[PDB]
Scaffold this active site. Structure first.
Site, mmCIF file in Angstrom:
data_model
loop_
_atom_site.group_PDB
_atom_site.id
_atom_site.type_symbol
_atom_site.label_atom_id
_atom_site.label_comp_id
_atom_site.label_asym_id
_atom_site.label_seq_id
_atom_site.Cartn_x
_atom_site.Cartn_y
_atom_site.Cartn_z
ATOM 1 N N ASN A 159 -14.158 -0.206 -6.382
ATOM 2 C CA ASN A 159 -15.233 0.679 -5.952
ATOM 3 C C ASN A 159 -15.997 1.321 -7.104
ATOM 4 O O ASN A 159 -16.351 2.504 -7.039
ATOM 5 C CB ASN A 159 -14.666 1.770 -5.046
ATOM 6 C CG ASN A 159 -13.812 1.205 -3.933
ATOM 7 O OD1 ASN A 159 -14.211 0.260 -3.249
ATOM 8 N ND2 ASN A 159 -12.616 1.755 -3.766
ATOM 9 N N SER A 200 -11.291 -1.104 -0.074
ATOM 10 C CA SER A 200 -9.968 -1.051 0.554
ATOM 11 C C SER A 200 -10.062 -1.320 2.050
ATOM 12 O O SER A 200 -9.105 -1.786 2.661
ATOM 13 C CB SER A 200 -9.297 0.311 0.339
ATOM 14 O OG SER A 200 -8.783 0.478 -0.971
ATOM 15 N N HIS A 202 -3.643 6.077 3.720
ATOM 16 C CA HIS A 202 -4.407 4.900 3.286
ATOM 17 C C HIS A 202 -3.809 3.592 3.821
ATOM 18 O O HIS A 202 -4.526 2.752 4.385
ATOM 19 C CB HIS A 202 -4.469 4.894 1.755
ATOM 20 C CG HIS A 202 -5.334 3.829 1.153
ATOM 21 N ND1 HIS A 202 -4.839 2.601 0.764
ATOM 22 C CD2 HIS A 202 -6.640 3.841 0.779
ATOM 23 C CE1 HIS A 202 -5.808 1.888 0.219
ATOM 24 N NE2 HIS A 202 -6.907 2.623 0.203
ATOM 25 N N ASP A 239 0.838 -1.208 0.000
ATOM 26 C CA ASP A 239 0.000 0.000 0.000
ATOM 27 C C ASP A 239 0.879 1.267 0.000
ATOM 28 O O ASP A 239 1.960 1.265 -0.591
ATOM 29 C CB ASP A 239 -0.940 -0.042 1.219
ATOM 30 C CG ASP A 239 -2.256 0.673 0.987
ATOM 31 O OD1 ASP A 239 -3.309 0.000 0.932
ATOM 32 O OD2 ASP A 239 -2.252 1.911 0.895
#
Ligand SMILES: [Ca+2]
Ligand SMILES: [Ca+2]
Length: 279
Positions: free
Chosen positions: A161, A224, A69, A39
């Site tokens: 998404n 996520s 994130h 990530d």
């Protein structure tokens, strides 16, 4: 063990019904397992990680999470307050820049790195990789995910998404990994969550409270956020000896809450991650 007034997502994965506020879990809490969070990085100094997180690789100038994130996702895997597997070891691999972006070549390199690096780590209960990222279909990205899984790592990836069929996104569309959709606290499919036959499982993804950079916390939404719930659950189950890296996704699907979700399109599984805890 029981965490009272837990984030709703933790409570949900230890209950057969929505609306509870306590997270019930075995005390072993993923000790002896390892989870790679691939990530934007991890703020390893955050008090919530208790010294159990460290950066092992970056593909940019710094290993710092300048975005947040990665720290959020890592927190849902294994922070003390916000995590599924509260005693697991976290390893950060920074394949995304501080804007949350990254080239496919870099993401692939990061996956191949984890397949090798795990051979230098003490993870007696097993190894998990959590990939809360993706983009358009790429057979090369799918292949890298398949390699990582093949090497003996439980790979969990976000479905995406776009409120669309995940078949057109990578690494979501790689069938051999564990592809995770998102649900909300009322057991609806999250309005943004991708769907389709390639999904393996759903986890909590809307309004998820976790760690953030600057030693803070915040609530955000996405597949996520669902992915680390499943990655954390896998690490937890591997530590208990219930399953292995090769079979964890199937075991999680087999033992899931079935038929609880609404707004699931025909052809998509109606399965919600569940730890089956019994005191
Ligand atoms: Ca139920
Ligand atoms: Ca799969």
């Amino acid at each position: 063990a029981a965490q009272t007034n837990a984030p709703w997502g933790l409570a949900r994965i230890s209950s057969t019904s929505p609306g509870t506020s306590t997270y019930y879990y075995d005390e072993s809490a993923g000790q002896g397992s390892c989870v790679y969070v691939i990530d934007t990085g991890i703020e390893a100094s955050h008090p919530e990680f208790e010294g159990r997180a460290q950066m092992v690789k970056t593909y940019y100038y710094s290993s710092r999470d300048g975005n947040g994130h990665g720290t959020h996702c890592a927190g849902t895997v294994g922070s003390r307050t916000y995590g599924v597997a509260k005693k697991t070891q976290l390893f950060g691999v920074k394949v995304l820049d501080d804007n949350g972006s990254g080239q496919y070549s870099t993401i692939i390199a990061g996956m191949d790195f984890v397949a090798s690096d795990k051979n230098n780590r003490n993870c007696p209960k097993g190894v998990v990789a959590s990939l809360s990222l993706g983009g358009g279909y790429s057979s090369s990205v799918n292949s890298a995910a398949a390699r990582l899984q093949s090497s003996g790592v439980m790979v969990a990836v976000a479905a995406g998404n776009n409120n669309a069929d995940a078949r057109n996104y990578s690494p979501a569309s790689e069938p051999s990994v564990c592809t995770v959709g998102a649900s909300d606290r009322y057991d609806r499919r999250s309005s943004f969550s991708n769907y389709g036959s390639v999904l393996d499982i759903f986890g909590p993804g809307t309004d998820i409270l976790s760690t953030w950079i600057g030693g803070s916390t915040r609530s955000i939404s996405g597949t996520s956020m669902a992915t680390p719930h499943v990655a954390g659950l896998a690490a937890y189950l591997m530590t208990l000896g219930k399953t292995t890296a090769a079979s964890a996704c199937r075991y999680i699907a087999d033992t899931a809450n079935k038929g609880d979700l609404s707004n699931i399109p025909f052809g998509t599984v109606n399965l919600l991650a569940y730890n089956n805890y019994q005191a």
